Ligand binder design. Structure first.
Ligand SMILES: OC[C@@H](O)[C@H](O)[C@H](O)[C@H](O)CO
Length: 297
């Protein structure tokens, strides 16, 4: 029968999130369902309230991008206990919670692929890395930075029998252009020998590139662990940005909606609790497969 789908987003305040929300809304409608959507505006307490509201409004399927991996456990457990099928998207929820599956980008494997590529590109070069991180305490952010850095190390070990790297500083850019720009400004003042920027998303790296260009600082390789944002892809095609990792907000949403509807309908069972989208490192070689200048994101 007809049932309602709820989509609870932690925030809509970066391009990825806006695109993900619209894709989720669109896919539920395409499949023939009413979609009720909420934006927590970056506030955990509001997201808890949003979930509770969607459950009493009668959603049978809840798609949630959680503001905190721990703080939403009780609300998700209660939704599931009241018969809602819950699919977590993008941000991690503690896997001890009761939900159907977590759909997200393959962050650890992307990081490995991206770090391996860096060594394919620069070889033995002594790396002096400025790190742009998203949000303190974010486990996806941590998986991305440590995935890329450990990928660099592993690739060096395999090729050279030894490894070395230096992270000259870390700034926090809150997943957006302005945040990346400001963090990079600080990093540039602090450090005169940077030869690589590592970002936990493209939006921050794109803002950082503007600080780099304003400062006239040359020789810096741009590396992102996520998401394949179109503006980054365009620069990768031009040779002005090194690599990114694949995290398609619309694919994540569609995957979650399709699987969730199948679960509600009894068409699928014994779903794995982790559902990772295809990993990829995207570079000048393969960018043409992925780049659409007219894309949403
Ligand atoms: O552009 C945002 C994107 O990288 C997203 O996957 C993350 O910010 C994630 O939501 C962090 O949990």
């Amino acid at each position: 029968g007809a049932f309602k789908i709820g989509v609870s987003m932690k925030t809509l305040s970066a391009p990825y999130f806006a695109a993900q929300m619209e894709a989720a809304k669109a896919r539920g409608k395409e499949l023939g369902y009413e979609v009720l959507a909420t934006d927590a505006q970056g506030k955990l307490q509001k997201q808890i309230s949003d979930v509770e509201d969607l459950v009493t409004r009668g959603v049978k399927l809840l798609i949630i991008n959680p503001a905190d991996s721990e703080g939403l456990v009780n609300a998700v457990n209660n939704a599931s206990a009241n018969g809602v099928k819950v699919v977590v998207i993008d941000s991690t929820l503690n896997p001890r919670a009761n939900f159907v599956t977590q759909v997200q980008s393959s962050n650890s494997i992307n990081g490995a692929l991206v770090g391996h590529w860096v060594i394919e590109e620069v070889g033995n070069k002594s790396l002096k890395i400025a790190l742009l991180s998203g949000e303190k305490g974010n486990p996806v952010g941590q998986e991305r930075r440590l995935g890329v850095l450990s990928g660099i190390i592993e690739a060096q070990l395999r090729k050279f029998g030894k490894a070395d790297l230096t992270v000259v500083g870390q700034g926090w850019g809150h997943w957006n252009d302005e945040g990346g720009l400001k963090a990079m400004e600080d990093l540039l003042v602090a450090n005169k020998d940077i030869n690589m920027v590592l970002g936990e998303n493209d939006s921050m790296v794109l803002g950082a590139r503007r600080a780099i260009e304003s400062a006239g600082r040359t020789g810096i390789l741009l590396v992102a662990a996520a998401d394949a944002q179109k503006e980054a892809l365009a620069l990768i095609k031009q040779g002005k940005y090194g690599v990114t990792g694949l995290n398609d907000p619309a694919l994540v949403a569609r995957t979650a909606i399709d699987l969730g509807v199948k679960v509600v309908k009894g068409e699928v069972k014994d779903v794995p609790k982790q559902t990772l989208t295809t990993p990829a490192a995207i570079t000048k070689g393969n960018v043409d497969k992925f780049y659409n200048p007219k894309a949403v994101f």
